[PDB]
Amino acid sequence: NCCVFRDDFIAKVLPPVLGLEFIFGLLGNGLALWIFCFHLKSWKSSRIFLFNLAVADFLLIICLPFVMDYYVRRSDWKFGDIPCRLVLFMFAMNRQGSIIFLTVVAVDRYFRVVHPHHALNKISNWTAAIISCLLWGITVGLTVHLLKKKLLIQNGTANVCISFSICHTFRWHEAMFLLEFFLPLGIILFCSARIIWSLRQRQMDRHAKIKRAITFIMVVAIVFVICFLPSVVVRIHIFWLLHTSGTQNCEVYRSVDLAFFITLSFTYMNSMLDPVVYYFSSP
Amino acid sequence: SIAQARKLVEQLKMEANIDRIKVSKAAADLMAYCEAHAKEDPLLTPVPASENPFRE
Amino acid sequence: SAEDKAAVERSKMIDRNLREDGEKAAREVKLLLLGAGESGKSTIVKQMKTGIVETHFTFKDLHFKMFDVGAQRSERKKWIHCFEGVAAIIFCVALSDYDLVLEMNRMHESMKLFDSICNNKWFTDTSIILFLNKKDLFEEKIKKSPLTICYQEYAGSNTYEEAAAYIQCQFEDLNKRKDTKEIYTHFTCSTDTKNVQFVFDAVTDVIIKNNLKDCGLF
Amino acid sequence: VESGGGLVQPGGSRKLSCSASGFAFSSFGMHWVRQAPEKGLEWVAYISSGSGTIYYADTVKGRFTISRDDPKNTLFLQMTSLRSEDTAMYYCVRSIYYYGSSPFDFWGQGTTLTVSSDIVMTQATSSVPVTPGESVSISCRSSKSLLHSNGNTYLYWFLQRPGQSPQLLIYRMSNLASGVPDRFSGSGSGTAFTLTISRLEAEDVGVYYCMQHLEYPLTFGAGTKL
Amino acid sequence: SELDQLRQEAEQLKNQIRDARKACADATLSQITNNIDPVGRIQMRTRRTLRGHLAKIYAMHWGTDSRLLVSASQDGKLIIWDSYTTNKVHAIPLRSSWVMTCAYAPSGNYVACGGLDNICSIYNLKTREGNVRVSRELAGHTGYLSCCRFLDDNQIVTSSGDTTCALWDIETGQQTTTFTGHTGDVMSLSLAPDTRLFVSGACDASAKLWDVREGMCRQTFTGHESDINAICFFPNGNAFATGSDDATCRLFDLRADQELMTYSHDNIICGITSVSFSKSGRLLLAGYDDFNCNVWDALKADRAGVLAGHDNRVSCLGVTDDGMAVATGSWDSFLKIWN
Ligand SMILES: C[C@@]1(c2ccccc2)OC(C(=O)O)=CC1=O
DSSP: OBOOOOOOHHHHHHHHHHHHHHHHHHHHHHHHHHHHHHHSSSEEEEEEHHHHHHHHHHHHHHHHHHHHHHHHTTTTOOOOOOOHHHHHHHHHHHHHHHHHHHHHHHHHHHHHTTTTTGGGGGOOOOHHHHHHHHHHHHHHHHHTTTHHOOOOEEEEEEEEOOSSSSOEEEEHHHHHHHHHHHHHHHOOOOOOOOHHHHHHHHTSSOOOOOHHHHHHHHHHHHHHHHHHHHHHHHHHHHHHHSSSSSSOOOOHHHHHHHHHHHHHHHHHHHHHHHHHIIIOOOO | HHHHHHHHHHHHHHHHHHHOOOOOHHHHHHHHHHHHHHGGOTTTOOOGGOOTTOOO | OOHHHHHHHHHHHHHHHHHHHHHHHHTTTEEEEEOOOSSSSHHHHHHHHOOEEEEEEEETTTEEEEETTTOOOHHHHHHGGTTOOOOOOEEEEEEEGSSBBOOBBEEEEHHHHHHHHTTTTOOOOOOEEEEEEEEHHHHHHHHHHGGGGTTTTOOOOOOHHHHHHHHHHHHHHHHSSSSSSBBBOOESSSSOOOHHHHHHHHHHHHHHHHHHHHTTTT | OOOOOOOSSSSOOOOEEEEESSOGGGEEEEEEEEOOSSOOEEEEEEEOSOOEEEOOOSSTTTTTTEEEEEEEEEEEEEEEHHHHHHEEEEOOEEOOSSOOSSSSSBBBEEEEOOOOOOOOOOOOOOOOOOOSSEEEEEEEBBBSBBTTTTBBBBBEEEOOOOOSOOOOOOOSSBBOOOOTTEEEEEEEEEEEEEEEESSOOOOSSSEEEEESSSSSSSOOOOOBBB | HHHOOOOOHHHHHHHHHHHHHHOOSSSSSHHHHTTSSSOOOOOOOEEEOOOOOSSSSEOOOOOSSSSEEEEETTEEEEEEEEETTTEEEEEEEOOOOOEEEEEEHHHEEEEEEEETTTTEEEESSSSSSSOEEEEEEOOOOSOOOEEEEESSSOOOOEEESSSSSSETTTTTOOOEEEOOOSSSEEEEEETTSSEEEEEETTTEEEEEEEEEETEEEEEEEEEEEEEEEEEEEOSSSSSEEEEEESOOOEEEEEOOOOOOOEEEEOOOOOEEEEEEEOSSSEEEEEEEETTEEEOOOOOOOOTEEEEEESSOOEEEEEEEETOOOOEEEESSSSSSEEO
16 A cells, blocks of 8 residues: 655645746757757767757656646546556656766767777667667666556546655666766766866867866756756655655655655756757757 | 961961851841741650650 | 669768768868978977878977978969968077078068968968077077167167067067967977977967857957 | 689689789679580689679589688688589689670689589580681570660670680670681571671680670570681 | 050050940840740759769769769769669779869870879779779979869870969870960860860960960950859850859850850859850850759750759759759769759
């Protein structure tokens, strides 16, 4: 009997905020998709990795309207008993698939400023597609287990399509939420540190437009931390209550579970500033 | 460089001592050639698509 | 079609042989070397080791190609666009000809040549590596000769540090475009080392700026 | 030039090797045309440039194996199972294929070993008087039309002097091979082809063969002795 | 002061030449050819695109059979194409990667190339045993090679950047005749259809008409403002069109010895890099620095259409002897066969 509940404050916050992201998301990532396929005259290795970042974001933006209808029905998945698994599968496919294509872009930029003569900066467009294809493949390996297990528990008369229920178990999906953030933060932050340091030791910052480039190597790191850290920290607190003083009386879970639900709105934000920071910011 | 100017003068005399014809006479002959070979110009009048070696 | 399908697979063996030799040229750095004839290009050429002379040398597993076009003696504007795409331009200027004349002193004719090359419409993002050779004899010459012969407006002590610095900043003045390119000036003696390493550092800054252009940061 | 080969053997296996000599072997497709002790020539195998497409005859499809080695300029033919039919003299022929090329230009000296549908060419004429100084015409026929969509008819004329390797006279319908005197000419219509000699000389005595190059299981035309 | 007397004499003599040329200007081509109806709009579609070059393309030349063409590029290769099927007959690697000219022999057994090395290299395509190999290196020029044309299988005429055009002997390898008289670099040349005279535009904004046999200049034409980048010869052989760096095409007459018509539009400021006539001489295709190719009505000086299919400057252009195609190389490493 894992505790799943709802609050009226969520209905006055999530439905309005989520609709705003979709409007911005559709114009942001949707327009950037047009340029990549019908306006970019040459496709190199780095534009291939950036393109998949929009594909993952677009796959997540298109699923937003279904989530919006979820709350307006007072947290009731009105239709799609079997698609409840399908929506929850591809939804988490994109979030983890967007992170992988955020680290690869930051890793690729690290090999272009710290190892300028390396052979990894001149890989052909074919080799970029093989690596990108595999990266999409490993995304399902940490996500496809959603479909196997049964979902959509029934609360007597209401039904809930929830995968992040507050229940103290060693679920593989449960711990993946922590590895999806800490490990990329141990690579994205480190890679952007050398880029913003080697560009300074070699005195290339001044007397050029590189100052703009160094700013974006730090704006990217700020966006990733802003949009993902608040969701993670509130989840770790739930583990503390789950491990000690919990799992029997879950009244205290009301604040954190509601906060976790609201803090998840920050994840959709990363899908919105990506065209602003990654594509449109660059020339 | 005394002979250098002489060479320019000597060659310039040959250019002056040349036979010339009225521009209209040259204009008529030039226009006549275009009409006489207007039927043998694939670019001016496209040939049937069966005769194009590049189309099919 | 039996003798025609065999003529297609020959056109494919030729196709792959162009890519194999086309990838080799992408891993090579092309440098353009200019000068005023006696500025000291011959001395620099030996340090890194009619028509256009191609010099090949390598450093730190990096292949360099260095072309000299000082023997052309024609209109520069007609063939200078062939070199549009070089990594950097190695400009050699002799500091010991500030008073020698060809009329006009030999240092002014280098400034006029530098002005056209630096402010050319084809060389926009190409970094310029300006070498100032003959530093040994230049130091001795200013002791018995004044620098005011070349630059009348100059007003300072006849010291090597002051004279050399004044000449160097005079060349960077001619660069009308101070934001699209950088000039890596250097001082070279007749018997000196590490000259090739200085060229290597100035080329790396062009490769990094080239790599960022591919990704999009530039 | 090119030469080299094996010897005789009883019902076993043997290897045939040909050594190129200074003609850029790496860009020439090589054939292995063979000739019976008394009959005409017959195609056996072919390997393209760079070891791409490989073709075999109908009777040597599985028993034979061809290979090439651009290093050291050597062409290899591996024969595993030999019957009483495969005793003949084996020639090595080079051929380069581009728009204006002339395939089958050079033929090897040839080696002999003893062991102890398709397009058929008629070439009805088999014997002509040896009287010189006049004009002699040699005719040939094909089962199906040799004229292709691109517009050139693939038919090659070869001359085999008694004792030496075959030589190419006319490649395709009318184009005359290099090093061949201008008395030879060729006219055809797609199914019927003729070879004309203006002034017969003492060097024109031999057997004249025909050949098709439309479909790769190609066949010769049994020759015509003069 | 003999120089002062000589200098004044030349000016007085030049005035007589100008007066004689103007005396015969009874009318103009535009006035004479008012009656003839316009040729109408011309639509040309890219029937083929040839790919394989990895650098800028500076020269091309059609074969005499209107099927094979040779393209020279600064990646070090000289590719011979089969324009009907886009095949690659040959790929010749050059000793010097700085090549700015190419040629195709009328017989078809030879091709030539040259550039910043002041050397015209003849390649033997016959290849009695093997592949295409160098047959001769014609050295002796002081400046870069800008154009080379095959008079026959043994004679080639080359124009260099040292203000001199030359006639060579391929079999021997020596300068048979040297043409002098230009003051600026010679940038292009064009042989007459009967191969007895050839014109040569130079950077001094003047084109001269030479005699191959005697070796002396015959007529000098002026009227341009900047360097003459390219030149072409009318099919009749009594006229030639030049393209200069001030965005204008001019048509001169050999017998009239004066400019006939000019092809300029106020919307074009980009220079001209190539000119060529159609089979009948009615059209005048020209390449520009603005990435486009324009087709001009020679008899009416009216634009008849554009050929916009390139993403960079158009450097070379040619029309087949059959007259049924136009090939346009450019700096983006692409060749296109139009119509
Ligand atoms: C908001 C929510 C969702 C998604 C689709 C349909 C309903 C609810 O998204 C997650 C998730 O980030 O995986 C867990 C949820 O409860």
